[PDB]
From Swiss-Prot, chains A, B, C, D, E, F, G, H:
Entry's Gene Ontology cellular component terms: cytoplasm; nucleoid
Cellular localisation: Cytoplasm, Nucleoid
PROSITE patterns in the record: SPOVT_ABRB
Annotated Gene3D superfamilies: Transcriptional regulator MraZ domain
Annotated S-S bridges: none
Name under which the protein is recorded: Transcriptional regulator MraZ
SUBUNIT field: Homooctamer. Forms a ring.
Length: 141, 141, 141, 141, 141, 141, 141, 141
């Protein structure tokens, strides 16, 4: 479990080469490669290739004849990239994805069990600022 | 059963090191590690790692394309922590979680079969104060 | 069947030590332990531990993100207790549960097949007093 | 079949000891014990213990969190009794059940395949008096 | 098929002993016993005991808590009878059923695949008189 | 296939003995017996006994407590007949069915894969005259 | 795949004997026989007999008691024909079907994976002329 | 994965012979043949023949009696083509498809996991220009 469950919050920073250093314990979870792709609320997601594979299945589920479905698939998959995790367990984040997630210096990683989200410390703090209560949001599920 | 079913109410206190002493009988249920994470109504939940694993499944169930789903996952999992239960069967509760559950001195633990909820004695008494009748709440299920 | 089907009505009394004497034939049904927990309409329920185990399953079924679900689970499970049936087949009823079910002297036990309900003779007679006809109540199922 | 399918109408009477004489052919169907319990429209039902066992399953089906469900279960099961059929194939009907079904002298038994209903000749004749046509009632199923 | 499919229309008459003579070819279909029971539109139905057995299943399907369901079951099953087909392939029709189906002299039997319906020649001719077109009735299925 | 799929349109005539001559190729499909029965729009249907057997299943599907269902079953099955196909592959059509389908001289047979429909040349031409477009009718399926 | 997937558009012409020359590559797909039958929008469809067999299944699915269903089945199946593909891979198209699809000289064949549609070059061009956008039509699926 | 998951965005150009050069890494994914066919929003899709095979299944799913379904199938499949990927991994794009996707000079390829979409650099940039936010589009799934 220690390293098969993506949980918690990690404060790390964007290196001068645009790389990110996975929290060691996490490195376990992944092999030597991952798929980054753009997330919701400007966050960028990170999955083990296999997991990304499944994440996609959930979509074939969605129509396809629906204009919206096509927009989603395009906004996400045309932006997914496949990145190798280097020896030190770092991951080079693509430029477009960097820009998309407004990544500057100081990142926040959070575990979402399945995947990992990469946030710009500020943008994340803001996101948390709005957002109704956990109880409010849950009531609507 | 005796230590396979989390039941009852236990009045215990928050130690000077922010640790909590599981009610002995309970210690059985858990191994030497648990996942704490924030609960509903400011309570903080406690599960055996394996159980937490399943609890997460229930979520993949929920959309993901729904803004709300993403808020839930983030408010909960970015706050889950993984804690080792010490020799005396105590558990060190993280600060953020401490603050989140308004844990001061004097805790109330209740069994919810699957998991355990940690409440600030006061906050819990209040919660119980409001809340409609068991019959009222049940009628709506 | 004689003692695997919880049926009928038994008039028994609350002993000076707050114990209850199962109707002998019933003792069969149970082992040497049960789970008491609070029931609906102030009655207190009694199940074989295994059965209680299943009763809980029916709940995971219910949302969890619903405030109501959480209130139910809390009002019931934080009040369940696990009690050993003594040699004479008696069961010591916890104080809180005693107070909750307004148990004084003179109890009424009724079989509900799965479980057993413990009623204060008066409170039960009243309950029966209101309540629409069997036919009325059934029509709405 | 002859004694595996409870069918027809039998006019029998309530003996001075409150016993009822099963129609011989029926005696086959049952062993030496049955479960009586209150029926709908003041009739009292009669099943082989095993069958009663199944009849109950249909109920776990019904909510439980519904006040109505609880009223049904209570009005029926707290009134079921378990009675041994004597050598002559007679069944002693409990007092409460006697009163409940307004059993005086002169009973009417009808087969309902699964179970048997015991009616007070008058009350039954009345019931038949009202009740819309078979065709009317059926149209609504 | 010749005698395993209940089809067609047969004009036969009610004998002085209230017996009916199955159309020979039909006799095949049945053993030496059947279940008569009241049908819809005053017709009286006839099934092989086994088939009647299944016909009943369709009913457990229907609620039971519904007053209507109970009325149906009672109007039909308290009137079913079990009759042995005699050597000449005749069936003695009970009085009540005779009266119920207004059986005088001159009967009309029709095959309904599963079962057989017994009609009073007149009552049947009338029934056919009203009744909308086959096309009308079918459109509503 | 050639004689396993009832297709096309055949113009044949009603013989002086009310017999019909199956189109040779068709004779294959059937054995030496069929079930005729009344069809929709005054057409009379023709199936291999086995197939008719299945066609009936589709009906048990339909309620039975519905007045309409009973009318359908009666209008169709009390009119089905079972006819042997003679050596020359002809089929003697019953009088009632003849009258029902307004069969005079000059018949039109059409294949409906499963079954065969027998039409009076005129009545069929008319039917085709009304009837909305194939596209219209299909849109509503 | 090359010849197991009916795709594309082929411009061919109606021969002086009303035959059509399958595009060679296609000939593979089919054996030496096909079922033609009338299509939607005056096009005439072409399937391998086996495939036509399945296409029909989709219909038993549709009611049958619905007047519309009966109209569809009749408009299509009474017009299906079964045609042998000759040595040169040509198919003789029936007259009625010729007239129905307004086939003159110059045909357009299009692949619809399962089947093949035969269009009169003009009628097809027109069809394409109207018809909303692919995106419009898809949105409604 | 690297060549089993069609991801990313590639800027390539339309050669003087109307051919397109797959991004090398992609060439892996495909054999030596693909099916091009018109996509949504004027893009042209590209699948391995086998995959296209499955994509079609999703359609049999859709009615067929629906005018719209027929329009879709026709607009897409009558335009699919089957193209061999040449030695250098290039693909010759048909004229009609070229015109349909307004392909001039400068193409944009995007991975959609299952398939590949070919866009005219401009038309694609525009498409991206409109289109609501990822979050907006997702909320509606």
């Amino acid at each position: 479990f220690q390293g098969h469950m993506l949980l918690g919050t990690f404060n790390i920073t964007l290196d001068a080469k645009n790389r990110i250093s996975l929290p060691a314990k996490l490195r376990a979870f992944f092999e030597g490669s991952i798929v980054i792709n753009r997330g919701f609320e400007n966050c960028l997601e990170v999955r083990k290739p296999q997991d990304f594979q499944k994440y996609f299945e959930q979509f074939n589920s969605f129509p396809s004849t629906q204009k919206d479905t096509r927009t989603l698939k395009r906004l996400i998959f045309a932006n997914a990239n496949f990145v190798d995790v280097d020896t030190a367990g770092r991951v080079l984040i693509p430029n477009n994805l960097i820009n998309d997630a407004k990544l500057d210096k100081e990142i926040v990683l959070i575990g979402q069990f399945d995947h990992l989200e990469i946030w710009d410390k500020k943008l994340y703090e803001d996101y948390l600022a709005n957002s109704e209560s956990l109880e409010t949001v849950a009531e609507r599920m």
